[PDB]
Amino acid sequence: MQLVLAAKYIGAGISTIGLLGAGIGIAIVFAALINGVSRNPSIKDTVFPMAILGFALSEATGLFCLMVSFLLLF
Amino acid sequence: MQLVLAAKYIGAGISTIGLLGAGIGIAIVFAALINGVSRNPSIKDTVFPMAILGFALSEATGLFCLMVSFLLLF
Amino acid sequence: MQLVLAAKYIGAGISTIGLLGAGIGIAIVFAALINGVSRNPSIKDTVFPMAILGFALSEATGLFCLMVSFLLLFG
Amino acid sequence: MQLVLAAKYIGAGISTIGLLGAGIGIAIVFAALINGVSRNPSIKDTVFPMAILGFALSEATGLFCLMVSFLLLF
Amino acid sequence: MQLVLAAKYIGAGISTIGLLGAGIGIAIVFAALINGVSRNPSIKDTVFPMAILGFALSEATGLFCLMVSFLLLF
Amino acid sequence: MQLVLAAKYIGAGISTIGLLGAGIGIAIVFAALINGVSRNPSIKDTVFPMAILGFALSEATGLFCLMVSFLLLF
Amino acid sequence: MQLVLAAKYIGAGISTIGLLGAGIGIAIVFAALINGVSRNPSIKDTVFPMAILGFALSEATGLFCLMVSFLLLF
Amino acid sequence: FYFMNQLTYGFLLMITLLILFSQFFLPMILRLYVSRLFISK
Amino acid sequence: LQSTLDNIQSARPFDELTVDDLTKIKPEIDAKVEEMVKKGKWDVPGYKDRFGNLNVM
Amino acid sequence: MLKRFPTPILKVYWPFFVAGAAVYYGMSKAADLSSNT
Amino acid sequence: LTTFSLYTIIVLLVITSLYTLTNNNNKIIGSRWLISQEAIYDTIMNMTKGQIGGKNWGLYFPMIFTLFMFIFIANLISMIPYSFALSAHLVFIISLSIVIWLGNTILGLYKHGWVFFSLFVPAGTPLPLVPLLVIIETLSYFARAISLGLRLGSNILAGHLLMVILAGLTFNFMLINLFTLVFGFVPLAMILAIMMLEFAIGIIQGYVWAILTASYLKDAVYLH
Amino acid sequence: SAWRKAGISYAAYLNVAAQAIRSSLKTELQTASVLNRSQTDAFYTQYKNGTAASEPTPI
Amino acid sequence: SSGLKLQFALPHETLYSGSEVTQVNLPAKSGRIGVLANHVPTVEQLLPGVVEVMEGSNSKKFFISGGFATVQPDSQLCVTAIEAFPLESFSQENIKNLLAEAKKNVSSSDAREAAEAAIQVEVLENLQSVLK
């Protein structure tokens, strides 16, 4: 109950490493959203929904990483 | 046997690193979709379906990573 | 129990990496907002809350990673 | 035998990261696809098959990585 | 407790990878600031404070990892 | 003996991560190809051979990485 | 102090990696500076102090990482 | 395990919820839509 | 038509008309609703022309 | 107030219902097999 | 009746009260809650039109609507301090994803039969690349089979676990410490932030589920 | 430079860019054509029923 | 087609119309494009800069006053310019310098005129650079 718990925590860390991609992903989605509404103010009502869609999908990927970490924590 | 389960957990943790690529991939897909809707709003109806297809492919890569981790665990 | 606490510290230290993504994300949002407001000044009132929300979500992911590190440390 | 299977699991976990770049690759090909299509609707019929082939085998590279991980496991 | 302090130092060493995000963050923030002021000098008076605030938030995200590593040093 | 095989498997795992570059590279090649053929439809016939050659060379680098991983394993 | 000093050396080596992000910060700041000054020579006089401050602030993070590595060595 | 308490029960639940929704609640929205259309036309 | 205007003057439930009352008055709308329900064509042609969507999408 | 309107529940939604029945049958079959208890 | 049974019966009671009990006498005014339900109906119907429309969107709108309301009521009872995430197994979402994928595949094999195998070859990809394409698309569909469950279920469980761990680790918030100033109240600020994040994430991922199942239905009915 | 927001439009930008050379022209190149181009006698006289015809301001 | 044809026109007297020409510099907002021959159709806003036109005779410099660098798949380079720089007879230091320094004081007079005076001084400085 010593090495197994140790590698459990280590693997939890190696799984939480993945939220970087989700963060940069929601970032680039919001970034292109900003650029799109910048080029055309009038397309905001159309580009908002799929942008928050992409944010949700990337956040769900980050929470997949978090779930992989959590089964290695509880 | 304890080291075997420890390395199982370590490999499961490492298997989740590849998911950040899937997240940033779906994100840049939706970012380019935002930019395309900005340039051509009228092409949104034609462009959204294979945008969903690209999201599906990148999330599929992330899910291969997730399933590899899952089978490494159980 | 020495190895358990040792790996707790290691796991927290490597779990702190998520602030890399948090910073890269908040700054990507800020950079896009800067470009948008410079290209057109009028849209600032409608694009500021967007960037604020994006920064909030990115720093929220960073806080999730930090809290994972904290629970690896003290739990 | 413990160490052999343990490092087999570790190598399988490290090997499946290949889906990170497979997803990033299909996403980048798709992003340029969206940009070009929105900038030129008439090029759809002659760009679609090439892009499909491109991201398909780009994901097949990640499939090769998955096969390497599988042979490391089995 | 020898291995405890050893892995504490290891975690402090790896906890500094979060500064990478702060670095590339100030990178992209100032890059976009320079591009924007190159677009038109008028927007400088309104775009500079948010660039400063964004650098402050990025350096705060880096200081989070710095403080955690310091906790793993003292 | 068993440690040699263990490090052999771990080296194969850390060699499989070489394919990420091949994936991202073939992505950028086909991305620029799609953008270019979308710009002017008359250039596709001229640009296809060079694009497929560069793709084949990137896949050759990826195959070199895979062959190193295999000669590690086998 | 065998393991403790060993882990100190490993942690310093791992901490040394913040300089990559610091260099990317300075580099893209100077790249945006070059692009802006080439786009409009007049804006160069205003942007140059901005670039000075930006690269100084970016190098501050690299200096922090260097100090963290240094305290792990002596 | 303790699976024969929420999965099949959950299936019966979403079946009956789908039936109730589609047969009751959507028709009210449809009725108000068509009534507004009729007295507007 | 004087009877019609006299009724419309003080018997016009603009904000308090019962949908059940509307259905009972005219069975034609009921017939249309069941016919289009059993047909499967849930569209009601000409419904976004005058009624907004406030769509967050 | 409340009335029953007969929308198609089986003519069009049969595949989902049959998939649910198959999933339930598979779960029942694997309860004594895929439990390891 | 277990915890899941009482949770589901309470959910059904409240969801039916939100419609049949909101109408005091079912007027034509369409009150604020009535207009909220109307807006939700209109939004789901235009998901259907936009993403599966063209011949038979209306036929498939009702399952989109019902799944949206079920997920909405599930996500609404997620942030209450006692609120248990539907017995906290979340395998129900996986079962929903699997059954929906199976139904979509059955519909494809019914309306297309062997032509469903031609969906793996959209436009080009000649014979030398056909097996690779069909393998890739089959694996993508297999991943889709698990995408929906390991998504909403994962996010709900992760939010609940974050809730529990946060509440556990700040048990000394003003118990015995002397440094319980606003610096020690910052954990309350992050808990509030994750409240807002969980709410927004639940709503936007219900929208994600709706749009994903709409896209899957379109791919099933329409071959491209 | 800023000939759209701070300035007016592309027309005045190009006109003044040409006029910079036109005024800074050598005497040998200074002929009747460039002199005619330099001279500007058009007065902005907006319509009455269209723009109230305030005054004939310079173009 | 063989080579490239350039259509250079000026309001006073048109210069070129369908004449065989090699690489021609076309300073745009970003930079000049040395179109050798054929070339993909393009549309670029020209900025005051040196338009250097090679033929078989010599390399003559033509400081342009603006226009558009528009091309067609039939390889038609119609540069709609206004004023050119015939050889170097147009060069004169003093008038350009005095006009620049005299428009500096009115560089902040009235909104549009203030903004355009800066651009006028910028093109005068470009003239200074072309003066050689």
From Swiss-Prot, chains A, B, D, E, F, G:
GO terms for molecular function: identical protein binding; lipid binding; proton transmembrane transporter activity. It is a multi-pass membrane protein. Keywords: CF(0), Formylation, Hydrogen ion transport, Ion transport, Lipid-binding, Membrane, Mitochondrion, Transmembrane, Transmembrane helix, Transport. The record marks E59 as: Reversibly protonated during proton transport. The keyword Transmembrane helix applies. The modification N-formylmethionine is found at M1. InterPro entries: ATP_synth_F0_csu, ATP_synth_F0_csu_DDCD_BS, ATP_synth_F0_csu_sf, ATPase_proteolipid_c-like_dom, F/V-ATP_Csub_sf. It is found in: Mitochondrion membrane. GO terms for biological process: proton motive force-driven ATP synthesis. The chain crosses the membrane at residues 14-34, 52-72. PANTHER family: ATP SYNTHASE LIPID-BINDING PROTEIN, MITOCHONDRIAL, ATPASE PROTEIN 9. F-type ATPases have 2 components, CF(1) - the catalytic core - and CF(0) - the membrane proton channel. In yeast, the dimeric form of ATP synthase consists of 17 polypeptides: alpha, beta, gamma, delta, epsilon, 4 (B), 5 (OSCP), 6 (A), 8, 9 (C), d, E (Tim11), f, g, h, i/j and k. Belongs to the ATPase C chain family. This is ATP synthase subunit 9, mitochondrial. It comes from Saccharomyces cerevisiae (strain ATCC 204508 / S288c) (Baker's yeast). The lineage of its organism: Eukaryota, Fungi, Dikarya, Ascomycota, Saccharomycotina.
Swiss-Prot record, chain C:
It is a multi-pass membrane protein. It comes from the Eukaryota. The gene is OLI1. This is ATP synthase subunit 9, mitochondrial. It comes from Saccharomyces cerevisiae (strain ATCC 204508 / S288c). The record marks E59 as: Reversibly protonated during proton transport. GO terms for molecular function: identical protein binding; lipid binding; proton transmembrane transporter activity. F-type ATPases have 2 components, CF(1) - the catalytic core - and CF(0) - the membrane proton channel. In yeast, the dimeric form of ATP synthase consists of 17 polypeptides: alpha, beta, gamma, delta, epsilon, 4 (B), 5 (OSCP), 6 (A), 8, 9 (C), d, E (Tim11), f, g, h, i/j and k. GO terms for cellular component: cytosol; mitochondrial inner membrane; mitochondrial intermembrane space; mitochondrion; proton-transporting ATP synthase complex; proton-transporting two-sector ATPase complex, proton-transporting domain. Keywords: CF(0), Formylation, Hydrogen ion transport, Ion transport, Lipid-binding, Membrane, Mitochondrion, Transmembrane, Transmembrane helix, Transport. It is found in: Mitochondrion membrane. The modification N-formylmethionine is found at M1. InterPro entries: ATP_synth_F0_csu (IPR000454), ATP_synth_F0_csu_DDCD_BS (IPR020537), ATP_synth_F0_csu_sf (IPR038662), ATPase_proteolipid_c-like_dom (IPR002379), F/V-ATP_Csub_sf (IPR035921). GO terms for biological process: proton motive force-driven ATP synthesis.
Swiss-Prot record, chain I:
Keywords: Acetylation, ATP synthesis, CF(0), Hydrogen ion transport, Ion transport, Membrane, Mitochondrion, Mitochondrion inner membrane, Transport. Signal peptide: none annotated. GO terms for molecular function: proton transmembrane transporter activity. The keyword Signal does not apply. Its main location: mitochondrion. One of its GO terms (cellular component) is mitochondrial inner membrane. Disulfide bonds: none annotated. It is found in: Mitochondrion; Mitochondrion inner membrane. Transmembrane segments: none annotated. Mitochondrial membrane ATP synthase (F(1)F(0) ATP synthase or Complex V) produces ATP from ADP in the presence of a proton gradient across the membrane which is generated by electron transport complexes of the respiratory chain. F-type ATPases consist of two structural domains, F(1) - containing the extramembraneous catalytic core, and F(0) - containing the membrane proton channel, linked together by a central stalk and a peripheral stalk. During catalysis, ATP synthesis in the catalytic domain of F(1) is coupled via a rotary mechanism of the central stalk subunits to proton translocation. F-type ATPases have 2 components, CF(1) - the catalytic core - and CF(0) - the membrane proton channel. In yeast, the dimeric form of ATP synthase consists of 17 polypeptides: alpha, beta, gamma, delta, epsilon, 4 (B), 5 (OSCP), 6 (A), 8, 9 (C), d, E (Tim11), f, g, h, i/j and k. Present with 6820 molecules/cell in log phase SD medium. This is ATP synthase subunit d, mitochondrial. The gene is ATP7.
Curated annotation (Swiss-Prot), chain M:
Its main location: mitochondrion. It comes from Saccharomyces cerevisiae (strain ATCC 204508 / S288c) (Baker's yeast). The gene is ATP16. This is ATP synthase subunit delta, mitochondrial. The keyword Ion transport applies. Mitochondrial membrane ATP synthase (F(1)F(0) ATP synthase or Complex V) produces ATP from ADP in the presence of a proton gradient across the membrane which is generated by electron transport complexes of the respiratory chain. F-type ATPases consist of two structural domains, F(1) - containing the extramembraneous catalytic core, and F(0) - containing the membrane proton channel, linked together by a central stalk and a peripheral stalk. During catalysis, ATP turnover in the catalytic domain of F(1) is coupled via a rotary mechanism of the central stalk subunits to proton translocation. Belongs to the ATPase epsilon chain family. Keywords: ATP synthesis, CF(1), Hydrogen ion transport, Ion transport, Membrane, Mitochondrion, Mitochondrion inner membrane, Transit peptide, Transport. GO terms for biological process: proton motive force-driven ATP synthesis. F-type ATPases have 2 components, CF(1) - the catalytic core - and CF(0) - the membrane proton channel. CF(1) has five subunits: alpha(3), beta(3), gamma(1), delta(1), epsilon(1). CF(0) has three main subunits: a, b and c. It is found in: Mitochondrion; Mitochondrion inner membrane. The keyword Mitochondrion applies.
